[PDB]
Write a protein that binds this ligand. Structure first.
Ligand code: OCR
Ligand code: OCR
Ligand code: MYI
Lengths: 260, 274
């Protein structure tokens, strides 16, 4: 069976590499400084970042808000929607996932993408900032935290999580299995056939356990610690939805709003 | 097979179970015995409505399980004040249990308080599942049984307090853990280290790691054929967090809607800036 677990782990890694452009290994090389990314540390930096390197985001569109805080918040949305498709492609590569009731596949993705988005966003963050637009840029943590109204605190919670999550020192091969475990959560509301879902997650967990023991022999109970982080993830997610709610108190296209 | 390493983990498991039995008067084993209505000496009086409640005070005498307020003129309030007193008593039991966790009393005094402050309700909900089945919950140390529907029809504010507990319990109980398992799981909850405001996270994480090791072996030896029970159990910890958060919000509403109802100081201190 150990062979089958290593096969699964390898398969997930390969798929993870193909589905996600910017890996943690790549992101870390850039973050530690081991072509420097454009650093957005203030307002003028931003404006030059958009101009000197048209960030493939919302910035191009007219009739927006031309208000930095609002445009930054919306760029986060554009990228999130983009990430959702990468996550979806990856999910279909998970053994058994496609064979699940189609409604359940949609339910799992619906409730799983936010947890995965923040998990992976941690790979692109350090206590000082976050990598943006395929790593071409680095947006300062301080800059983000200096945004007015409720925008100054929308990213901070992700940073706090990232700092702690990153302490586990997971690599892409570990993350590939962890992400799949998140997707196959049988406790998502509205599921029609929980059994198959838990059966797959059980096999994924077994693979994750072996992966962490072979990959980090020195880290006692790393498996247990990683699973505990699920608590942190869901907290950051619900917390995110709440701010997202309060946002409907600022009033920050129709087809665009439909898309995002 | 057996080695000095796993031997130490088994000794710790035994210690924790022993201490658990000494700290908690109503174990899951006793709870299930009463619930499975097996015997004729352990039969609880069932409170499923007002009249039953009225007569319950007679049969399953409540040594003021509900704060001395005589006829508090309100079922919802009396029941509520009743669960408050029980919670305080449970906090006392858990506190006694915590001191038995190797290394716990050796940690910084402030962290000791922090760990109890954030771990207490999570443990209470975990153990409360031992006293529940899909139809109700044992009360007054097992002498009584209050139905889920009765509690569910209390009143706008209160009628919603227990449902989330029951929902959790039905799923958690599906794991079929026994007291020896829970003693370690509860110890793991207490020694988190990821609690807000901890001064020295390191020593705490070292203790928890050893407890997680103890829990892992325990589950595999006690539940041979229950694949990934360990991981499924740890995932339940997020369910507990949810319950607590939701319960806190309910309390805020009660605080404002019932300005004439006192809330226990101990509990108030625990929820403060939580
Ligand atoms: C926006 C919110 C989520 C990012 C979505 C997925 C995370 C994984 C990779 C993308 C990160 C790179 C990037 O941020 O573009 C978070 C923000 O930092 C807002 C900035 C707006 C994006 C340029
Ligand atoms: C209160 C309702 C629910 C119980 C609340 C908390 C559970 C705490 C401890 C359980 C023990 C678990 C263990 O140690 O195994 C119900 C009442 O008590 C009110 C009714 C009183 C009648 C007026
Ligand atoms: C229903 O009344 C209450 C009031 C305050 C409380 N604090 C802790 C609990 C335990 C639980 O949630 O069962 C509780 C119950």
């Amino acid at each position: 069976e150990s062979a089958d677990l290593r096969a699964l782990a390898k398969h997930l890694y390969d798929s993870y590499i193909k589905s996600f452009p910017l890996t943690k290994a790549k992101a870390r090389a850039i973050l530690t400084g081991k072509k420097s990314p454009f650093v957005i540390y203030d307002m003028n930096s931003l404006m030059m970042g958009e101009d000197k390197i048209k960030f493939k985001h919302i910035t191009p569109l007219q009739e927006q808000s031309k208000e930095v805080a609002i445009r930054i918040f919306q760029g986060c949305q554009f990228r999130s929607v983009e990430a959702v498709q990468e996550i979806t492609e990856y999910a279909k590569s998970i053994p058994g996932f496609v064979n699940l009731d189609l409604n359940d596949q949609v339910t799992l993705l619906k409730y799983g993408v936010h947890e995965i988005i923040y998990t992976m966003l941690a790979s692109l963050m350090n206590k000082d900032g976050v990598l943006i637009s395929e790593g071409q840029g680095f947006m300062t943590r301080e800059f983000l935290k200096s945004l007015r109204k409720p925008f100054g605190d929308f990213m901070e919670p992700k940073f706090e999580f990232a700092v702690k999550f990153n302490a586990l020192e997971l690599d892409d091969s570990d993350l590939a299995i962890f992400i799949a475990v998140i997707i196959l959560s049988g406790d998502r509301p509205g599921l029609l056939n929980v059994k198959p879902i838990e059966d797959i997650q059980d096999n994924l967990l077994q693979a994750l356990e072996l992966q962490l023991k072979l990959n980090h022999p020195e880290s006692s109970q790393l498996f247990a610690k990683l699973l505990q982080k699920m608590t942190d993830l869901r907290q950051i997610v619900t917390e995110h939805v709440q701010l997202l709610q309060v946002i409907k108190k600022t009033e920050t296209h129709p087809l665009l709003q439909e898309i995002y």
